[PDB]
Design an enzyme around this catalytic site. Structure first.
Site, PDB file in Angstrom:
ATOM      1  N   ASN A   1     -30.487 -50.969 -58.020  1.00  0.00           N
ATOM      2  CA  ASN A   1     -30.151 -50.449 -59.341  1.00  0.00           C
ATOM      3  C   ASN A   1     -28.861 -51.031 -59.911  1.00  0.00           C
ATOM      4  OD1 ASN A   1     -32.272 -48.330 -59.941  1.00  0.00           O
ATOM      5  ND2 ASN A   1     -31.564 -47.784 -57.863  1.00  0.00           N
TER       6      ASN A   1
ATOM      7  N   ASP B   1     -29.581 -34.387 -65.606  1.00  0.00           N
ATOM      8  CA  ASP B   1     -30.634 -34.954 -64.781  1.00  0.00           C
ATOM      9  C   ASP B   1     -31.842 -34.022 -64.793  1.00  0.00           C
ATOM     10  OD1 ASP B   1     -32.053 -36.612 -62.999  1.00  0.00           O
ATOM     11  OD2 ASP B   1     -30.930 -35.955 -61.228  1.00  0.00           O
TER      12      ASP B   1
ATOM     13  N   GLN C   1     -28.747 -42.521 -74.610  1.00  0.00           N
ATOM     14  CA  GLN C   1     -27.463 -42.186 -75.205  1.00  0.00           C
ATOM     15  C   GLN C   1     -26.353 -42.190 -74.150  1.00  0.00           C
ATOM     16  OE1 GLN C   1     -27.408 -38.080 -76.733  1.00  0.00           O
ATOM     17  NE2 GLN C   1     -25.365 -38.432 -77.580  1.00  0.00           N
TER      18      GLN C   1
ATOM     19  N   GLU D   1     -35.055 -35.128 -63.549  1.00  0.00           N
ATOM     20  CA  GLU D   1     -36.033 -35.652 -62.589  1.00  0.00           C
ATOM     21  C   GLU D   1     -36.933 -34.608 -61.924  1.00  0.00           C
ATOM     22  OE1 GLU D   1     -34.373 -37.287 -59.116  1.00  0.00           O
ATOM     23  OE2 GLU D   1     -33.518 -39.107 -60.055  1.00  0.00           O
TER      24      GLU D   1
ATOM     25  N   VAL E   1     -22.974 -40.577 -73.136  1.00  0.00           N
ATOM     26  CA  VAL E   1     -22.305 -39.324 -73.466  1.00  0.00           C
ATOM     27  C   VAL E   1     -20.790 -39.542 -73.618  1.00  0.00           C
ATOM     28  CG1 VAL E   1     -23.984 -37.584 -72.736  1.00  0.00           C
ATOM     29  CG2 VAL E   1     -22.556 -38.760 -70.984  1.00  0.00           C
TER      30      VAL E   1
ATOM     31  N   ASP F   1     -32.872 -28.142 -61.706  1.00  0.00           N
ATOM     32  CA  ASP F   1     -31.626 -28.658 -61.141  1.00  0.00           C
ATOM     33  C   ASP F   1     -30.428 -28.137 -61.939  1.00  0.00           C
ATOM     34  OD1 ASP F   1     -30.152 -30.349 -59.150  1.00  0.00           O
ATOM     35  OD2 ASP F   1     -29.774 -31.664 -60.927  1.00  0.00           O
TER      36      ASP F   1
ATOM     37  N   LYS G   1     -30.208 -48.719 -67.599  1.00  0.00           N
ATOM     38  CA  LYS G   1     -30.371 -48.685 -66.153  1.00  0.00           C
ATOM     39  C   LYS G   1     -31.482 -49.666 -65.789  1.00  0.00           C
ATOM     40  CE  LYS G   1     -29.381 -44.547 -64.329  1.00  0.00           C
ATOM     41  NZ  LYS G   1     -29.436 -43.128 -63.952  1.00  0.00           N
TER      42      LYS G   1
END
Ligand SMILES: [Cl-]
Ligand SMILES: [Cl-]
Ligand SMILES: [Cl-]
Length: 363
Positions: A38, A250, A119, A252, A121, A225, A58
């Site tokens: 990554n 997050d 975006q 996910e 932040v 989460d 990313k």
């Protein structure tokens, strides 16, 4: 179609300009992270893109992991990206009347070049940062956070019941990777006890029940989460005393599951903060959440299931957070293990359950 190199700054600017037509500052670019798979870039634009002059990109590199691992990674991305799109589309009925809770917008996801744009932040601090600083977060600000997140989460759970059968909602019911992560987490309950001297033979049963609920429940849509490490606070650029926005970062693990999973995460984290950091910040926040959650939710809380959810959080996170001393952590986990006996026994004088009832009272 051209093959691009997103691991170099120059290849980045080709991709952005040639493929997406963006007007890119050749000198508004900085690498943030980067290993074998990554890369994360921070990027400054000379002209807006979907309203934004600063964005992050990313990038997963293929052929630097097994085929199986790379596939599951892409799945996680898509659920994260698609979850954020769902909240952008339901912004009105979720972000409330005058509400300040929001999600960092997702702008583009290119599955051909493994390139996701979001975006940017800013370098904001987490909730977790504000509550561990000495001095701690003003109590007026802690009340508001609690009130706003409670109302968001309630609106979330309401819409997830009534739109359960729409196909964009059922998509998250199928987030099996996300349900499995929850399972793997619930499996550390018995080890984490064993490590601290506690060895209660109820825990096998309690774990079984938590694992089944999370693998099979289709009750509502859950953020999955919702703790303070995954929550950013935007304070006024100057006055450190006025809150502007709360971001939930997050997504996910977003999925269909029991409502209590979201209450366990956040109330659980409040309990940890009350015990090892600031009692008034953790307790204000807890009560504000329960107050607005109970007023907004169109279904009654299940106090046994939320009690057990909180117990779960305590046993799973006390060690991770690494707060206070070994000895104190041992006794805190013991109170968690005790709370499972109160949930199964439907005991309303239990230390946790009893508090829940008081703090979520109406009149
Ligand atoms: Cl911007
Ligand atoms: Cl589906
Ligand atoms: Cl400490």
């Amino acid at each position: 179609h051209m093959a691009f190199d997103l691991k170099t700054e120059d290849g980045l600017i080709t991709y952005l300009t040639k493929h997406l037509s963006l007007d890119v500052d050749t000198s508004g670019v900085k690498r943030l992270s980067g290993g074998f798979v990554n890369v994360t870039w921070r990027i400054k634009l000379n002209a807006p893109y979907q309203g934004h002059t600063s964005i992050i990109l990313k990038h997963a590199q293929p052929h630097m992991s097994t085929d199986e691992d790379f596939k599951i990674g892409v799945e996680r991305s898509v659920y994260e990206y698609q979850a954020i799109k769902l909240m952008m589309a339901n912004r009105e009925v979720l972000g409330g009347v005058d509400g300040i809770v929001s999600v960092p917008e997702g702008l583009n996801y290119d599955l051909e070049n493994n390139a996701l744009i979001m975006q940017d932040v800013g370098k904001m601090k987490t909730l977790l940062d504000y509550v561990t600083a000495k001095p701690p977060l003003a109590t007026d600000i802690a009340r508001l956070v609690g009130t706003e997140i409670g109302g968001f989460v309630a609106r979330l759970h309401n819409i997830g019941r009534e739109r359960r059968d729409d196909p964009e909602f059922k998509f998250f019911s199928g987030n099996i990777v996300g349900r499995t992560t929850s399972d793997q987490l619930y499996q550390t309950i018995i080890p984490n006890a064993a490590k601290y001297g506690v060895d209660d033979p109820l825990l096998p049963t309690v774990v079984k029940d938590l694992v089944d609920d999370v693998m099979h429940s289709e009750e509502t849509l859950v953020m999955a989460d919702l703790w303070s490490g995954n929550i950013l606070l935007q304070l006024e650029e100057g006055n450190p005393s006025k809150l502007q926005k709360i971001y939930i970062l997050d997504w996910e693990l977003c999925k269909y599951g029991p409502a209590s999973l979201d209450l366990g995460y956040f109330l659980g984290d409040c309990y940890l903060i009350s015990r090892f950091q600031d009692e008034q910040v953790g307790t204000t926040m807890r009560q504000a959440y329960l107050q607005s959650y109970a007023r907004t939710s169109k279904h009654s809380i299940n106090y046994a299931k939320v009690t057990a959810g909180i117990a779960a959080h305590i046993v799973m996170w006390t060690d991770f957070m690494q707060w206070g001393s070994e000895e104190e952590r041992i006794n805190f986990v013991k109170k968690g293990v005790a709370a499972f006996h109160d949930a199964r026994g439907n005991n309303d004088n239990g230390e946790i359950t009893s508090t829940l009832l008081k703090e979520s009272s109406t009149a």
